[PDB]
């Protein structure tokens, strides 16, 4: 049995400025990769011996993914700020945790897609991987929008596809 | 590899 996890966190800075974004990956609850925007030259770097054997273009690619995720987090911070009717001076934190539990053979056993806002849980994809759970009434808005656009299908593309395969490849180097 | 959220909340 195995598992893969990504924790992507963004913290808005007061007034003028752009959020601090960090992203970390865990294979079997061991950190193997890390991104930070504060870094002098923000890129994805390996936090474990084996991941070093991956070609430069891998790092460039996933670094690009991080560079998009930044924008996503900035904008959706603004959105959640709006839903909760909060002053735009406040410092706020938005986190996305997502991953996959893979069984002994290699099949997908569980999928994970969840979002928290300012420490509290906002919205989480259920075990059936097609239904969401929403903590409050803003999360009810997000839930409605995502039921309508079918975000579960979009995430299932990853959970059932890239997640399992890349987890297997990351285990190939252990 | 990481994913991209894409969907606006």
């Amino acid at each position, epitope marked *: 049995p195995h598992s893969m996890r990504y924790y992507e966190t963004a913290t808005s800075r007061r007034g003028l400025g752009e959020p601090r974004y960090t992203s970390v990956g865990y294979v079997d609850d061991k950190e193997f990769v890390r991104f930070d925007s504060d870094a002098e030259n923000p890129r994805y770097e390996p936090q474990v011996p084996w991941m070093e054997q991956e070609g430069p273009e891998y790092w460039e690619r996933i670094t*690009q*993914i991080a560079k*998009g995720q930044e*924008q996503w987090f*900035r*904008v959706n911070l*603004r*959105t959640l700020l709006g839903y909760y009717n909060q002053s735009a001076g406040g410092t706020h934190t938005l986190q996305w945790m997502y991953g996959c539990d893979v069984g002994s053979d290699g099949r997908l056993l569980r999928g994970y897609e969840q979002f928290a806002y300012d420490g509290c849980d906002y919205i989480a994809l259920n075990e059936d991987l097609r239904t969401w759970t929403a903590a409050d009434m803003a999360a009810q808005i997000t839930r409605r*929008k995502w039921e309508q*656009a*079918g*975000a579960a*299908e*979009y995430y*299932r*593309a990853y959970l*059932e*596809g*890239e997640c399992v395969e890349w987890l297997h490849r990351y285990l190939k180097n252990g | 590899v990481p994913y*991209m959220a*894409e*969907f*606006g909340m």
Partner: T-cell receptor
Amino acid sequence: AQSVTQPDARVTVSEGASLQLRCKYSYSATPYLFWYVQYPRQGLQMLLKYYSGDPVVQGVNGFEAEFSKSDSSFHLRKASVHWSDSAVYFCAVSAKGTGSKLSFGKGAKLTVSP
Amino acid sequence: AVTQSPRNKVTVTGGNVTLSCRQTNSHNYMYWYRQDTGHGLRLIHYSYGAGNLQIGDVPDGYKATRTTQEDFFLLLELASPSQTSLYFCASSDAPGQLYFGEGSKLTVLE
């Protein structure tokens, strides 16, 4: 980099007949596939979408598109077309990293003869 | 509902045209496309949230401004006959899921 191809620019079909509009696109490990319809003198409306799962996306208007990983396609079918279905049909695709930036086909003008 | 104005505009080469788009949804993405027979839909400029501006596939001759979440403007300061087309505004809050305006027909005369 991504490219989308619709082979026939103009298609004429009898009313009540069977229709197929074709969409082939450049390879993608992460294909997001769509069909948009544009009725005369309007903008585009999303008709069908596919991100994953059951490759047969089934519309409520009788339309349905099917994603083929092997053929690398997303073809649009209707068993029995209505006269109202006369429109211009665009298929569009996007990939990971540009999920929100579509690549459009040249479209196919559909004339339903009564 | 996405609205755009003007629905019809005629101008001369070297003219100054400003296409306005306003969305009632609170979508983060907004796009300016042009539709030409033979080329289909071609992205000019787009925007992810207010203040943001990104280059499309054919941005030459065009400029754009995203003042607010709801408004997106397309600016043609030196009009060209090549810019004679049918312009569409779109909005999205989901990958590849777009809501179009009803179109703006521009004619540029030599």
